[PDB]
Amino acid sequence: SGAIYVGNYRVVNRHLATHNDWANLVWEDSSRDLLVSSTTAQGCDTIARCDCQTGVYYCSSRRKHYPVSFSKPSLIFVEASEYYPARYQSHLMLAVGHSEPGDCGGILRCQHGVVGIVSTGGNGLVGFADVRDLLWLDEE
Ligand SMILES: Cc1cc(C)c(Nc2ccn(C)n2)c(C)c1
Ligand SMILES: [Zn+2]
């Protein structure tokens, strides 16, 4: 589990969104595994606006933050899980790292701010849903 709290927005994995998230929906995209809902309080996370390929992510199944190198956001085939059938997921970045289903929501960050959240995993790989192209998170 985990979310990004920026301005009056809450960014979560779409497959982990709650009824309150759907009842206060701002935007959702199944192909990206992302859902954004509105919040009453303002959040403290800052979104990175950059092309970094090195950063650090939080892995709840190890209670540790790991430094990683990660690929550029791309269209990647992801195998079937309990949340999605086998399909192409867009704006996804991969790194070598430990991940379990419950690690989804962990933040990946670089020197500029939050880059994305854990969304996929298995066999020593971890995939992150990018949020750096969602410029509207910084306003309104
Ligand atoms: C972060 C994360 C997410 C998921 C859903 C998974 N399990 C599975 C099982 C089959 N897939 C394709 N994925 C793992 C290991 C890690
Ligand atoms: Zn950066």
Side-chain angles (χ1 to χ4, degrees), residues 41-86:
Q42 282 193 275
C44 298
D45 294 321
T46 286
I47 308 298
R49 300 295 177 200
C50 69
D51 61 356
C52 286
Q53 285 189 248
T54 68
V56 171
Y57 82 108
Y58 182 60
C59 174
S60 66
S61 65
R62 295 284 182 268
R63 286 201 188 97
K64 271 198 198 53
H65 292 258
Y66 292 103
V68 286
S69 300
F70 54 93
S71 65
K72 291 202 182 201
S74 324
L75 185 64
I76 302 283
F77 196 71
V78 182
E79 293 301 318
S81 65
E82 57 207 311
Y83 316 106
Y84 294 103

mmCIF file of all heavy atoms in Angstrom, residues 41-86:
data_model
loop_
_atom_site.group_PDB
_atom_site.id
_atom_site.type_symbol
_atom_site.label_atom_id
_atom_site.label_comp_id
_atom_site.label_asym_id
_atom_site.label_seq_id
_atom_site.Cartn_x
_atom_site.Cartn_y
_atom_site.Cartn_z
ATOM 1 N N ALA A 41 -7.086 18.053 3.020
ATOM 2 C CA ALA A 41 -5.829 18.678 3.464
ATOM 3 C C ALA A 41 -4.778 18.702 2.354
ATOM 4 O O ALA A 41 -4.771 17.812 1.499
ATOM 5 C CB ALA A 41 -5.256 17.927 4.660
ATOM 6 N N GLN A 42 -3.842 19.660 2.418
ATOM 7 C CA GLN A 42 -2.765 19.720 1.431
ATOM 8 C C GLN A 42 -1.645 18.753 1.798
ATOM 9 O O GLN A 42 -1.314 18.587 2.982
ATOM 10 C CB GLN A 42 -2.216 21.142 1.295
ATOM 11 C CG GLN A 42 -3.121 22.034 0.469
ATOM 12 C CD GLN A 42 -2.388 23.287 0.114
ATOM 13 O OE1 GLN A 42 -2.358 24.247 0.893
ATOM 14 N NE2 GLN A 42 -1.740 23.278 -1.050
ATOM 15 N N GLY A 43 -1.059 18.138 0.776
ATOM 16 C CA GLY A 43 0.032 17.192 0.948
ATOM 17 C C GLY A 43 1.391 17.833 0.795
ATOM 18 O O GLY A 43 1.510 18.955 0.295
ATOM 19 N N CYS A 44 2.440 17.090 1.223
ATOM 20 C CA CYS A 44 3.824 17.554 1.292
ATOM 21 C C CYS A 44 4.772 17.002 0.232
ATOM 22 O O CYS A 44 5.938 17.431 0.205
ATOM 23 C CB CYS A 44 4.383 17.278 2.684
ATOM 24 S SG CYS A 44 3.512 18.152 4.012
ATOM 25 N N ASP A 45 4.342 15.987 -0.546
ATOM 26 C CA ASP A 45 5.220 15.454 -1.572
ATOM 27 C C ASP A 45 5.354 16.458 -2.732
ATOM 28 O O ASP A 45 4.406 17.189 -3.049
ATOM 29 C CB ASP A 45 4.664 14.121 -2.078
ATOM 30 C CG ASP A 45 4.690 13.021 -1.022
ATOM 31 O OD1 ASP A 45 5.697 12.953 -0.251
ATOM 32 O OD2 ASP A 45 3.728 12.221 -0.969
ATOM 33 N N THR A 46 6.534 16.492 -3.344
ATOM 34 C CA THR A 46 6.834 17.304 -4.526
ATOM 35 C C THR A 46 7.083 16.317 -5.680
ATOM 36 O O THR A 46 7.776 15.324 -5.472
ATOM 37 C CB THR A 46 8.124 18.092 -4.265
ATOM 38 O OG1 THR A 46 7.760 19.147 -3.349
ATOM 39 C CG2 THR A 46 8.714 18.685 -5.528
ATOM 40 N N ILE A 47 6.517 16.583 -6.870
ATOM 41 C CA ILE A 47 6.729 15.686 -8.005
ATOM 42 C C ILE A 47 7.999 16.088 -8.753
ATOM 43 O O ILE A 47 8.181 17.274 -9.057
ATOM 44 C CB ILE A 47 5.521 15.680 -8.979
ATOM 45 C CG1 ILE A 47 4.168 15.412 -8.241
ATOM 46 C CG2 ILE A 47 5.729 14.667 -10.119
ATOM 47 C CD1 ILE A 47 4.120 14.009 -7.544
ATOM 48 N N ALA A 48 8.818 15.101 -9.120
ATOM 49 C CA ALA A 48 10.015 15.357 -9.923
ATOM 50 C C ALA A 48 9.608 15.719 -11.350
ATOM 51 O O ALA A 48 8.653 15.153 -11.897
ATOM 52 C CB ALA A 48 10.874 14.095 -9.982
ATOM 53 N N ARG A 49 10.331 16.668 -11.964
ATOM 54 C CA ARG A 49 10.079 17.039 -13.350
ATOM 55 C C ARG A 49 11.473 16.923 -13.989
ATOM 56 O O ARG A 49 12.271 17.869 -13.921
ATOM 57 C CB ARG A 49 9.480 18.470 -13.431
ATOM 58 C CG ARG A 49 8.131 18.623 -12.685
ATOM 59 C CD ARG A 49 6.941 17.812 -13.248
ATOM 60 N NE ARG A 49 5.729 17.986 -12.416
ATOM 61 C CZ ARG A 49 4.692 17.146 -12.416
ATOM 62 N NH1 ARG A 49 4.706 16.066 -13.189
ATOM 63 N NH2 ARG A 49 3.646 17.364 -11.618
ATOM 64 N N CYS A 50 11.788 15.734 -14.552
ATOM 65 C CA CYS A 50 13.163 15.411 -14.994
ATOM 66 C C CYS A 50 13.206 14.110 -15.826
ATOM 67 O O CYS A 50 12.195 13.405 -15.915
ATOM 68 C CB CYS A 50 13.981 15.215 -13.724
ATOM 69 S SG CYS A 50 13.499 13.711 -12.818
ATOM 70 N N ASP A 51 14.432 13.695 -16.289
ATOM 71 C CA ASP A 51 14.549 12.399 -16.947
ATOM 72 C C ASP A 51 15.547 11.495 -16.184
ATOM 73 O O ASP A 51 16.202 10.653 -16.800
ATOM 74 C CB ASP A 51 14.952 12.510 -18.423
ATOM 75 C CG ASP A 51 16.297 13.155 -18.662
ATOM 76 O OD1 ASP A 51 16.931 13.617 -17.665
ATOM 77 O OD2 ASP A 51 16.728 13.206 -19.846
ATOM 78 N N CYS A 52 15.635 11.640 -14.852
ATOM 79 C CA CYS A 52 16.485 10.749 -14.032
ATOM 80 C C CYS A 52 16.202 9.270 -14.309
ATOM 81 O O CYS A 52 15.062 8.864 -14.534
ATOM 82 C CB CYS A 52 16.328 11.047 -12.539
ATOM 83 S SG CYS A 52 17.119 12.580 -11.959
ATOM 84 N N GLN A 53 17.263 8.466 -14.261
ATOM 85 C CA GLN A 53 17.151 7.016 -14.340
ATOM 86 C C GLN A 53 17.814 6.361 -13.122
ATOM 87 O O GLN A 53 18.037 5.160 -13.150
ATOM 88 C CB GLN A 53 17.764 6.457 -15.640
ATOM 89 C CG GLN A 53 16.911 6.687 -16.853
ATOM 90 C CD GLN A 53 17.458 5.922 -18.059
ATOM 91 O OE1 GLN A 53 17.934 6.505 -19.023
ATOM 92 N NE2 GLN A 53 17.408 4.602 -18.040
ATOM 93 N N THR A 54 18.108 7.144 -12.042
ATOM 94 C CA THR A 54 18.612 6.617 -10.794
ATOM 95 C C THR A 54 17.813 7.278 -9.662
ATOM 96 O O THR A 54 17.440 8.470 -9.745
ATOM 97 C CB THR A 54 20.121 6.785 -10.611
ATOM 98 O OG1 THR A 54 20.430 8.157 -10.472
ATOM 99 C CG2 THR A 54 20.909 6.223 -11.766
ATOM 100 N N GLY A 55 17.512 6.486 -8.660
ATOM 101 C CA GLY A 55 16.727 6.984 -7.534
ATOM 102 C C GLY A 55 16.686 5.978 -6.409
ATOM 103 O O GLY A 55 17.525 5.082 -6.358
ATOM 104 N N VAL A 56 15.688 6.102 -5.512
ATOM 105 C CA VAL A 56 15.583 5.201 -4.366
ATOM 106 C C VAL A 56 14.108 4.865 -4.196
ATOM 107 O O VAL A 56 13.282 5.764 -4.335
ATOM 108 C CB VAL A 56 16.106 5.946 -3.093
ATOM 109 C CG1 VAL A 56 15.839 5.155 -1.821
ATOM 110 C CG2 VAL A 56 17.606 6.293 -3.233
ATOM 111 N N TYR A 57 13.779 3.584 -3.930
ATOM 112 C CA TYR A 57 12.363 3.250 -3.713
ATOM 113 C C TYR A 57 12.149 2.585 -2.346
ATOM 114 O O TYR A 57 13.073 1.961 -1.809
ATOM 115 C CB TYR A 57 11.810 2.335 -4.856
ATOM 116 C CG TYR A 57 12.129 0.851 -4.695
ATOM 117 C CD1 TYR A 57 11.144 -0.056 -4.344
ATOM 118 C CD2 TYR A 57 13.380 0.353 -5.033
ATOM 119 C CE1 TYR A 57 11.421 -1.427 -4.231
ATOM 120 C CE2 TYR A 57 13.661 -1.010 -4.955
ATOM 121 C CZ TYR A 57 12.672 -1.900 -4.580
ATOM 122 O OH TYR A 57 12.962 -3.258 -4.471
ATOM 123 N N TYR A 58 10.907 2.669 -1.802
ATOM 124 C CA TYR A 58 10.591 2.030 -0.540
ATOM 125 C C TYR A 58 9.982 0.677 -0.813
ATOM 126 O O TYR A 58 8.995 0.573 -1.554
ATOM 127 C CB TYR A 58 9.584 2.849 0.304
ATOM 128 C CG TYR A 58 9.311 2.177 1.631
ATOM 129 C CD1 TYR A 58 10.335 1.952 2.540
ATOM 130 C CD2 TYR A 58 8.027 1.758 1.972
ATOM 131 C CE1 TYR A 58 10.098 1.299 3.742
ATOM 132 C CE2 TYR A 58 7.785 1.069 3.158
ATOM 133 C CZ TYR A 58 8.808 0.895 4.062
ATOM 134 O OH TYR A 58 8.562 0.234 5.234
ATOM 135 N N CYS A 59 10.547 -0.356 -0.153
ATOM 136 C CA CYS A 59 10.085 -1.746 -0.254
ATOM 137 C C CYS A 59 9.494 -2.183 1.120
ATOM 138 O O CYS A 59 10.265 -2.500 2.058
ATOM 139 C CB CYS A 59 11.265 -2.622 -0.657
ATOM 140 S SG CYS A 59 10.881 -4.400 -0.664
ATOM 141 N N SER A 60 8.137 -2.190 1.259
ATOM 142 C CA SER A 60 7.544 -2.507 2.563
ATOM 143 C C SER A 60 7.826 -3.934 3.016
ATOM 144 O O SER A 60 7.983 -4.151 4.217
ATOM 145 C CB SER A 60 6.038 -2.246 2.595
ATOM 146 O OG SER A 60 5.312 -3.114 1.732
ATOM 147 N N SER A 61 7.963 -4.889 2.059
ATOM 148 C CA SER A 61 8.283 -6.300 2.392
ATOM 149 C C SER A 61 9.714 -6.498 2.937
ATOM 150 O O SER A 61 10.047 -7.614 3.364
ATOM 151 C CB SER A 61 8.028 -7.239 1.209
ATOM 152 O OG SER A 61 8.892 -6.955 0.119
ATOM 153 N N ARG A 62 10.536 -5.435 2.956
ATOM 154 C CA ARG A 62 11.866 -5.475 3.574
ATOM 155 C C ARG A 62 12.070 -4.314 4.570
ATOM 156 O O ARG A 62 13.184 -4.173 5.099
ATOM 157 C CB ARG A 62 12.964 -5.347 2.507
ATOM 158 C CG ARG A 62 13.003 -6.537 1.530
ATOM 159 C CD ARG A 62 13.640 -7.738 2.197
ATOM 160 N NE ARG A 62 13.720 -8.874 1.265
ATOM 161 C CZ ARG A 62 12.794 -9.813 1.148
ATOM 162 N NH1 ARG A 62 11.681 -9.755 1.885
ATOM 163 N NH2 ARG A 62 12.968 -10.831 0.291
ATOM 164 N N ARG A 63 11.063 -3.417 4.749
ATOM 165 C CA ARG A 63 11.189 -2.190 5.562
ATOM 166 C C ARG A 63 12.497 -1.432 5.217
ATOM 167 O O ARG A 63 13.270 -1.017 6.099
ATOM 168 C CB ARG A 63 11.185 -2.509 7.042
ATOM 169 C CG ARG A 63 9.831 -2.872 7.547
ATOM 170 C CD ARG A 63 9.794 -2.655 9.058
ATOM 171 N NE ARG A 63 8.538 -3.186 9.570
ATOM 172 C CZ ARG A 63 8.399 -4.393 10.115
ATOM 173 N NH1 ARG A 63 9.458 -5.192 10.265
ATOM 174 N NH2 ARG A 63 7.211 -4.805 10.531
ATOM 175 N N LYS A 64 12.774 -1.331 3.933
ATOM 176 C CA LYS A 64 14.008 -0.713 3.465
ATOM 177 C C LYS A 64 13.811 0.117 2.230
ATOM 178 O O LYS A 64 13.002 -0.223 1.352
ATOM 179 C CB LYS A 64 15.030 -1.816 3.123
ATOM 180 C CG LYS A 64 15.895 -2.239 4.303
ATOM 181 C CD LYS A 64 17.139 -2.979 3.843
ATOM 182 C CE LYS A 64 17.764 -3.770 4.973
ATOM 183 N NZ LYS A 64 16.778 -4.675 5.628
ATOM 184 N N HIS A 65 14.643 1.157 2.108
ATOM 185 C CA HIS A 65 14.694 1.975 0.902
ATOM 186 C C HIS A 65 15.935 1.515 0.143
ATOM 187 O O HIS A 65 17.035 1.415 0.726
ATOM 188 C CB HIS A 65 14.842 3.471 1.271
ATOM 189 C CG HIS A 65 13.625 4.030 1.947
ATOM 190 N ND1 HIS A 65 12.694 4.815 1.264
ATOM 191 C CD2 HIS A 65 13.261 3.963 3.243
ATOM 192 C CE1 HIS A 65 11.784 5.166 2.170
ATOM 193 N NE2 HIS A 65 12.074 4.660 3.363
ATOM 194 N N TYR A 66 15.772 1.219 -1.150
ATOM 195 C CA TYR A 66 16.894 0.737 -1.977
ATOM 196 C C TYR A 66 17.222 1.685 -3.104
ATOM 197 O O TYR A 66 16.314 2.082 -3.839
ATOM 198 C CB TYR A 66 16.509 -0.620 -2.633
ATOM 199 C CG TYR A 66 16.361 -1.796 -1.677
ATOM 200 C CD1 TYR A 66 15.109 -2.260 -1.307
ATOM 201 C CD2 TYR A 66 17.475 -2.420 -1.130
ATOM 202 C CE1 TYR A 66 14.964 -3.372 -0.483
ATOM 203 C CE2 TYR A 66 17.345 -3.523 -0.290
ATOM 204 C CZ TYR A 66 16.086 -3.999 0.026
ATOM 205 O OH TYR A 66 15.932 -5.084 0.860
ATOM 206 N N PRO A 67 18.534 1.952 -3.324
ATOM 207 C CA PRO A 67 18.916 2.748 -4.497
ATOM 208 C C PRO A 67 18.835 1.855 -5.751
ATOM 209 O O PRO A 67 19.239 0.669 -5.713
ATOM 210 C CB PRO A 67 20.384 3.148 -4.225
ATOM 211 C CG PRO A 67 20.894 2.115 -3.237
ATOM 212 C CD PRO A 67 19.697 1.494 -2.523
ATOM 213 N N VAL A 68 18.286 2.398 -6.827
ATOM 214 C CA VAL A 68 18.134 1.613 -8.069
ATOM 215 C C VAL A 68 18.377 2.451 -9.294
ATOM 216 O O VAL A 68 18.182 3.672 -9.262
ATOM 217 C CB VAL A 68 16.689 1.017 -8.194
ATOM 218 C CG1 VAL A 68 16.474 -0.133 -7.242
ATOM 219 C CG2 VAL A 68 15.603 2.077 -7.999
ATOM 220 N N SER A 69 18.743 1.776 -10.409
ATOM 221 C CA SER A 69 18.738 2.334 -11.742
ATOM 222 C C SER A 69 17.446 1.800 -12.381
ATOM 223 O O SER A 69 17.108 0.613 -12.190
ATOM 224 C CB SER A 69 19.913 1.818 -12.564
ATOM 225 O OG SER A 69 21.120 2.190 -11.922
ATOM 226 N N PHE A 70 16.721 2.657 -13.105
ATOM 227 C CA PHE A 70 15.446 2.252 -13.694
ATOM 228 C C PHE A 70 15.328 2.708 -15.145
ATOM 229 O O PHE A 70 15.978 3.678 -15.557
ATOM 230 C CB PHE A 70 14.233 2.702 -12.814
ATOM 231 C CG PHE A 70 14.232 4.191 -12.501
ATOM 232 C CD1 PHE A 70 13.538 5.092 -13.300
ATOM 233 C CD2 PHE A 70 14.877 4.684 -11.383
ATOM 234 C CE1 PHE A 70 13.529 6.465 -13.001
ATOM 235 C CE2 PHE A 70 14.866 6.046 -11.090
ATOM 236 C CZ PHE A 70 14.179 6.929 -11.888
ATOM 237 N N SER A 71 14.556 1.964 -15.939
ATOM 238 C CA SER A 71 14.381 2.258 -17.355
ATOM 239 C C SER A 71 13.496 3.491 -17.586
ATOM 240 O O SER A 71 12.842 3.969 -16.657
ATOM 241 C CB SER A 71 13.844 1.022 -18.090
ATOM 242 O OG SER A 71 12.540 0.680 -17.639
ATOM 243 N N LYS A 72 13.457 3.992 -18.808
ATOM 244 C CA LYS A 72 12.599 5.115 -19.156
ATOM 245 C C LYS A 72 11.146 4.631 -19.242
ATOM 246 O O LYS A 72 10.908 3.470 -19.594
ATOM 247 C CB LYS A 72 13.070 5.718 -20.479
ATOM 248 C CG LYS A 72 14.420 6.410 -20.331
ATOM 249 C CD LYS A 72 14.664 7.442 -21.422
ATOM 250 C CE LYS A 72 16.032 8.070 -21.270
ATOM 251 N NZ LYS A 72 16.125 9.386 -21.964
ATOM 252 N N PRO A 73 10.152 5.485 -18.925
ATOM 253 C CA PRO A 73 8.737 5.035 -18.974
ATOM 254 C C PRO A 73 8.401 4.452 -20.352
ATOM 255 O O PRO A 73 8.716 5.064 -21.360
ATOM 256 C CB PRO A 73 7.919 6.314 -18.734
ATOM 257 C CG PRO A 73 8.875 7.371 -18.344
ATOM 258 C CD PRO A 73 10.295 6.892 -18.499
ATOM 259 N N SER A 74 7.864 3.236 -20.376
ATOM 260 C CA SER A 74 7.612 2.551 -21.640
ATOM 261 C C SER A 74 6.364 1.664 -21.574
ATOM 262 O O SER A 74 5.760 1.483 -20.517
ATOM 263 C CB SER A 74 8.835 1.699 -22.029
ATOM 264 O OG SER A 74 10.076 2.283 -21.675
ATOM 265 N N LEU A 75 6.015 1.070 -22.738
ATOM 266 C CA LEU A 75 4.895 0.160 -22.852
ATOM 267 C C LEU A 75 5.517 -1.233 -22.662
ATOM 268 O O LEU A 75 6.356 -1.645 -23.476
ATOM 269 C CB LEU A 75 4.290 0.311 -24.260
ATOM 270 C CG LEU A 75 3.040 -0.471 -24.510
ATOM 271 C CD1 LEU A 75 1.896 0.011 -23.611
ATOM 272 C CD2 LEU A 75 2.636 -0.412 -26.017
ATOM 273 N N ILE A 76 5.190 -1.907 -21.565
ATOM 274 C CA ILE A 76 5.785 -3.199 -21.201
ATOM 275 C C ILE A 76 4.711 -4.271 -21.007
ATOM 276 O O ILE A 76 3.695 -4.013 -20.358
ATOM 277 C CB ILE A 76 6.548 -3.023 -19.852
ATOM 278 C CG1 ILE A 76 7.661 -1.928 -19.914
ATOM 279 C CG2 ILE A 76 7.081 -4.354 -19.312
ATOM 280 C CD1 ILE A 76 8.964 -2.301 -20.612
ATOM 281 N N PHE A 77 4.947 -5.496 -21.528
ATOM 282 C CA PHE A 77 4.029 -6.605 -21.297
ATOM 283 C C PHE A 77 4.207 -7.104 -19.862
ATOM 284 O O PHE A 77 5.330 -7.396 -19.434
ATOM 285 C CB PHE A 77 4.295 -7.771 -22.277
ATOM 286 C CG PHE A 77 3.135 -8.733 -22.297
ATOM 287 C CD1 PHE A 77 1.930 -8.377 -22.870
ATOM 288 C CD2 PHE A 77 3.242 -9.978 -21.724
ATOM 289 C CE1 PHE A 77 0.851 -9.255 -22.877
ATOM 290 C CE2 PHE A 77 2.168 -10.856 -21.743
ATOM 291 C CZ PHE A 77 0.977 -10.487 -22.318
ATOM 292 N N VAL A 78 3.100 -7.127 -19.094
ATOM 293 C CA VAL A 78 3.085 -7.571 -17.708
ATOM 294 C C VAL A 78 2.207 -8.821 -17.638
ATOM 295 O O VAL A 78 1.078 -8.801 -18.128
ATOM 296 C CB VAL A 78 2.513 -6.456 -16.773
ATOM 297 C CG1 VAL A 78 2.530 -6.905 -15.305
ATOM 298 C CG2 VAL A 78 3.287 -5.137 -16.966
ATOM 299 N N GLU A 79 2.703 -9.878 -16.996
ATOM 300 C CA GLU A 79 1.948 -11.123 -16.891
ATOM 301 C C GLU A 79 0.707 -10.964 -16.025
ATOM 302 O O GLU A 79 0.605 -10.008 -15.257
ATOM 303 C CB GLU A 79 2.849 -12.252 -16.345
ATOM 304 C CG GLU A 79 3.961 -12.648 -17.302
ATOM 305 C CD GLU A 79 3.484 -13.133 -18.652
ATOM 306 O OE1 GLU A 79 2.498 -13.905 -18.707
ATOM 307 O OE2 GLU A 79 4.092 -12.733 -19.669
ATOM 308 N N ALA A 80 -0.233 -11.916 -16.144
ATOM 309 C CA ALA A 80 -1.477 -11.884 -15.366
ATOM 310 C C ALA A 80 -1.190 -11.919 -13.872
ATOM 311 O O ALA A 80 -0.265 -12.630 -13.434
ATOM 312 C CB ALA A 80 -2.353 -13.075 -15.743
ATOM 313 N N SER A 81 -1.971 -11.151 -13.085
ATOM 314 C CA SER A 81 -1.907 -11.126 -11.613
ATOM 315 C C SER A 81 -3.379 -11.178 -11.101
ATOM 316 O O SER A 81 -4.311 -11.283 -11.926
ATOM 317 C CB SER A 81 -1.230 -9.842 -11.121
ATOM 318 O OG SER A 81 -2.025 -8.715 -11.468
ATOM 319 N N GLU A 82 -3.606 -11.091 -9.768
ATOM 320 C CA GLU A 82 -5.002 -11.092 -9.287
ATOM 321 C C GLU A 82 -5.737 -9.795 -9.672
ATOM 322 O O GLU A 82 -6.963 -9.768 -9.622
ATOM 323 C CB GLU A 82 -5.098 -11.333 -7.780
ATOM 324 C CG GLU A 82 -4.324 -10.322 -6.975
ATOM 325 C CD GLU A 82 -3.853 -10.820 -5.621
ATOM 326 O OE1 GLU A 82 -4.688 -11.394 -4.884
ATOM 327 O OE2 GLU A 82 -2.650 -10.641 -5.299
ATOM 328 N N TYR A 83 -5.004 -8.738 -10.088
ATOM 329 C CA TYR A 83 -5.614 -7.443 -10.394
ATOM 330 C C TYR A 83 -5.827 -7.150 -11.867
ATOM 331 O O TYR A 83 -6.715 -6.368 -12.207
ATOM 332 C CB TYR A 83 -4.798 -6.315 -9.781
ATOM 333 C CG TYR A 83 -4.357 -6.591 -8.364
ATOM 334 C CD1 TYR A 83 -3.037 -6.914 -8.077
ATOM 335 C CD2 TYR A 83 -5.265 -6.563 -7.314
ATOM 336 C CE1 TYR A 83 -2.629 -7.195 -6.780
ATOM 337 C CE2 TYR A 83 -4.862 -6.821 -6.008
ATOM 338 C CZ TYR A 83 -3.544 -7.142 -5.746
ATOM 339 O OH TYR A 83 -3.116 -7.368 -4.451
ATOM 340 N N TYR A 84 -4.985 -7.721 -12.751
ATOM 341 C CA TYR A 84 -5.114 -7.461 -14.185
ATOM 342 C C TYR A 84 -4.796 -8.745 -14.952
ATOM 343 O O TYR A 84 -3.878 -9.472 -14.552
ATOM 344 C CB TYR A 84 -4.070 -6.428 -14.631
ATOM 345 C CG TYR A 84 -4.263 -5.045 -14.038
ATOM 346 C CD1 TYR A 84 -3.466 -4.602 -12.994
ATOM 347 C CD2 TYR A 84 -5.297 -4.221 -14.465
ATOM 348 C CE1 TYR A 84 -3.616 -3.327 -12.464
ATOM 349 C CE2 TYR A 84 -5.446 -2.931 -13.960
ATOM 350 C CZ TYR A 84 -4.622 -2.500 -12.937
ATOM 351 O OH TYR A 84 -4.796 -1.241 -12.386
ATOM 352 N N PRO A 85 -5.429 -8.955 -16.122
ATOM 353 C CA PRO A 85 -4.973 -10.058 -16.981
ATOM 354 C C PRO A 85 -3.606 -9.676 -17.602
ATOM 355 O O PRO A 85 -3.131 -8.520 -17.457
ATOM 356 C CB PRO A 85 -6.075 -10.130 -18.059
ATOM 357 C CG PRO A 85 -6.520 -8.719 -18.210
ATOM 358 C CD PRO A 85 -6.443 -8.112 -16.801
ATOM 359 N N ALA A 86 -2.982 -10.605 -18.345
ATOM 360 C CA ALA A 86 -1.704 -10.308 -19.013
ATOM 361 C C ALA A 86 -2.002 -9.246 -20.071
ATOM 362 O O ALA A 86 -3.002 -9.364 -20.780
ATOM 363 C CB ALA A 86 -1.155 -11.571 -19.680
#
